[PDB]
């Protein structure tokens, strides 16, 4: 069978350019699987300051 | 302290201290009046000498609390704590921070800096309080710990008059044979040192000179004088001049010790009732 | 150590396994009077790899000058003040797996005239 099935049919449901490579993405956050990030702090709860920061317009 | 740091925090003479305490008392009084919670000069406001007397009796109680700590405590840690407490009320007033919270906190911060690595059960066990009330105090202790360093100007090192004592006695075992087996000298000197610690001596005099003066007082009380040791220190710079300064400092130290006395408990309880009523008065800070 | 011009150093094993790439290694075998531990090619060997590091550094770098495949392999000792700055110190030439120091055009002539006269 064809094995060039897209990184779609594989990762198909997620929106956006899933097929696009990490180099094209140019995202510091994406560079993480290759070298594991350190767990400096445990996950924290959401705060009112965050909502005040956003709230759209 | 050729290590500087305390070179900035060595207040030079009696009057400046008096003035600073007085000014902080005025400062709190004024902030409160301006806030306008009360009309100026009401009964509640305290007086600086009364505040100082209450502080000294409560501090003697704090020293007993340090002594009854279940784990063995180095004399360095107790001293560090007292010094930290005196220096704290040179910037603020008794009412702004209740003395009990300040005492307990000085003690925990002190233990953390001096590497006593205290066990958490040992600290809670020493306090004779209900676990829930001790935890309420511990919550305040956290906030007041950061508050202490803020008003301590982040200057944490404290020179403790002990190390010099051991050192001078080794010099004793070596340079001068005129005196011998100076250990009677050792205990009496300790007695003079606790009495010296209760005074503003830590703030004014140099700690090494404080230890030397304790040794000299012990010697005079028992039958020996160290003119010859003073003479080996004269084998040094200033030629004749060093000795006059040493003698003047020794005389002033003796005078403060003879004049200093524990505040009477009858007077102290009156003061306590007044302060308690005072913190029970409405402060409330901000929204 | 009396006279470096009058010393010759060799080793049979390295002789059959000799190639343009290994000439520096043969000079580097250590316990060789001509070469020294102070040279940086030795400092490099202590570290990992060798490339343009002789230009990044600028010091004692023994480098091959001219090479004939079978036997002739001439080595030159340079002292660099900076990249693109070379100062030649001496030349050691290897003939038939035998290392000699290149005689000065004048020390050789002085000794020669002395013996004849």
């Amino acid at each position: 069978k064809k094995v060039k099935e897209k990184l779609s049919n594989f990762l198909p449901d997620l929106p956006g350019m899933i097929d696009l490579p990490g180099s094209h993405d140019n995202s510091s956050l994406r560079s993480l699987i290759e070298k594991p990030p350190i767990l400096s702090s445990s996950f924290n709860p959401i705060t009112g300051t965050m909502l005040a920061g956003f709230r759209l317009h | 302290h050729n290590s500087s740091q305390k070179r900035h925090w060595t207040f030079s003479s009696e009057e400046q201290l008096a003035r600073l305490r007085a000014d902080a008392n005025r400062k709190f009084r004024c902030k409160a009046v301006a806030n306008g919670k009360v009309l100026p000069n009401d009964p509640v406001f305290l007086e600086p000498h009364e505040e100082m007397t209450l502080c000294k009796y409560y501090e003697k109680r704090l020293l007993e609390f340090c002594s009854v700590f279940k784990p063995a405590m180095p004399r360095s840690v107790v001293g560090t704590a007292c010094m930290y407490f005196k220096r704290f009320y040179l910037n603020n007033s008794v009412m702004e921070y209740h003395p009990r919270i300040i005492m307990l906190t000085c003690a925990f911060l002190a233990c953390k800096v001096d590497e006593f690595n205290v066990s958490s059960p040992q600290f809670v066990g020493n306090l004779r309080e209900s676990p829930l009330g001790q935890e309420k105090a511990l919550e305040q202790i956290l906030e007041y710990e950061l508050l202490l360093i803020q008003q301590l100007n982040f200057h944490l090192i404290v020179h403790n008059p002990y190390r010099p004592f051991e050192g001078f006695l080794i010099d004793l075992k070596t340079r001068y044979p005129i005196l011998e087996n100076p250990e009677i000298l050792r205990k009496t000197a300790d007695d003079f040192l606790n009495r010296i610690a209760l005074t503003d001596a830590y703030l004014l005099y140099t700690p090494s000179q404080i230890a030397l003066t304790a040794i000299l007082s012990s010697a005079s009380r028992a039958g020996i004088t160290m003119e010859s040791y003073l003479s080996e220190s004269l084998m040094l710079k200033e030629n004749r001049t060093c000795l006059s300064q040493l003698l003047d400092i020794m005389k002033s130290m003796r005078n403060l010790v003879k004049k200093y006395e524990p505040p009477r408990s009858e007077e102290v309880a009156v003061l306590k009732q007044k302060l308690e009523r005072c913190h029970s008065a409405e402060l409330a800070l901000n929204v | 150590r009396d006279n470096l011009l009058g010393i010759s150093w060799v080793d049979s094993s390295w002789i059959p396994i000799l190639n343009s790439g290994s000439v520096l290694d043969y000079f580097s075998e250590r316990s060789n009077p001509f070469y020294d531990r102070t040279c940086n090619n030795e400092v490099v060997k202590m570290q990992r790899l060798t490339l343009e590091h002789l230009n990044q550094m600028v010091g004692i770098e023994y480098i091959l000058l001219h090479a004939q495949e079978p036997i002739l392999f001439i080595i030159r000792k340079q002292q660099r003040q900076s990249p693109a700055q070379v100062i030649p110190l001496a030349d050691y030439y290897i003939i038939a797996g035998v290392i000699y120091q290149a005689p000065d055009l004048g020390s050789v002539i002085n000794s020669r005239v002395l013996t004849a006269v």
Binding site: - | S3, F108, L109, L142, L146, I149, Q150 | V43, Q47, G59
Partner: protein
């Protein structure tokens, strides 16, 4: 005014910027802790030590707690921003492989160590990093979290402290007491790395690191400081024939050969002292220590 977010730290977070006051560049620290317990221990011991020790230690080769505030729960510590760090610099593929520059780095580190030893306060944990290089390049020491005073009175001296790869042999045994020895052996391993270009002795965990320390310097002789097995926890290590310093780092100028042999000497008593090392003739030699104007800079 926070202007940059360099990132989080082991027990702290850092931001780079200009403060409420002057426009000068500085690095700002924010206190980090697990405050979940309703019985928190207030501030951490590492923080307490670091702040006062840095404030006291003022030297051209020591960083210092300059300004310090804390109106909110937050405690703010002010330290000058530095260029980078020797460790990543030599970690990277040889960009500007230079030799007398290594000697200049060693001189700055040794002057800082001499000042700290004179002030009577051991730097408990020099690690390869935790050493910072500024724009001028004067290198001043930095991480001060694990340090402690060392004095005549007997007290519980903390144990098993320095990072495994850089560990003093007496500490590796399990010794209850210590002296300038830890800091000296560690500068020694950092020099080792600058010359060798990769870390000297690799230890996955305590015992393996002690084994390699022994393999690199051979079995310590009985004459060395007998009681080496009489300290509280010792295991006879392999009876290595032993290798000369010439073996592990193959070569360099022998003066460097001597400083190394000396920092290494096994008897903690003989581990060379700071003043002693500066006085070594290697520093006063024909190779000149770099002023730092020409000190190598990467990106």
């Amino acid at each position: 005014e926070k202007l940059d977010f360099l990132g989080e730290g082991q027990f702290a977070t850092v931001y780079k910027a200009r403060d409420k006051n002057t426009n000068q560049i500085v690095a700002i620290a924010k206190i980090k802790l697990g405050h979940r317990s309703e019985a928190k221990d207030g501030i951490n011991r590492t923080a307490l030590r670091e702040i006062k020790l840095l404030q006291e230690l003022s030297h051209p080769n020591i960083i210092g707690l300059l300004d310090a505030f804390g109106h909110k729960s937050n405690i703010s510590l002010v330290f000058d921003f530095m260029e980078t760090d020797l460790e990543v610099i030599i970690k990277d593929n040889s960009l500007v492989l230079t030799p007398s520059h290594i000697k200049a780095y060693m001189l700055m580190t040794l002057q800082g160590l001499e000042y700290l030893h004179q002030h009577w306060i051991l730097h408990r944990d020099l690690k390869p990093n935790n050493l910072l290089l500024d724009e001028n390049g004067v290198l001043k020491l930095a991480d001060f979290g694990l340090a402690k005073s060392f004095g005549s009175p007997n007290r519980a001296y903390t144990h098993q402290v320095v990072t495994r790869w850089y560990r003093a042999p007496e500490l590796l045994f399990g010794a209850r007491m210590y002296g300038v020895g830890v800091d000296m052996w560690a500068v020694g391993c950092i020099l080792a790395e600058l010359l060798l270009r990769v870390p000297f002795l690799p230890g996955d965990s305590d015992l393996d690191q002690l084994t390699r320390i022994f393999e690199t310097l051979g079995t310590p002789t009985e004459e060395q400081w007998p009681d080496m097995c009489s300290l509280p926890d010792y295991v006879t290590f392999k009876s290595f024939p032993g290798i000369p310093l010439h073996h592990i780092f193959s070569a360099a100028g022998d003066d460097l050969l001597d400083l190394i042999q000396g920092l290494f000497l096994f008897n903690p008593c003989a581990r060379i002292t700071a003043t002693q090392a500066l006085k070594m003739k290697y520093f006063s030699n024909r190779p000149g220590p770099t002023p730092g104007c020409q000190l190598p800079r990467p990106n």
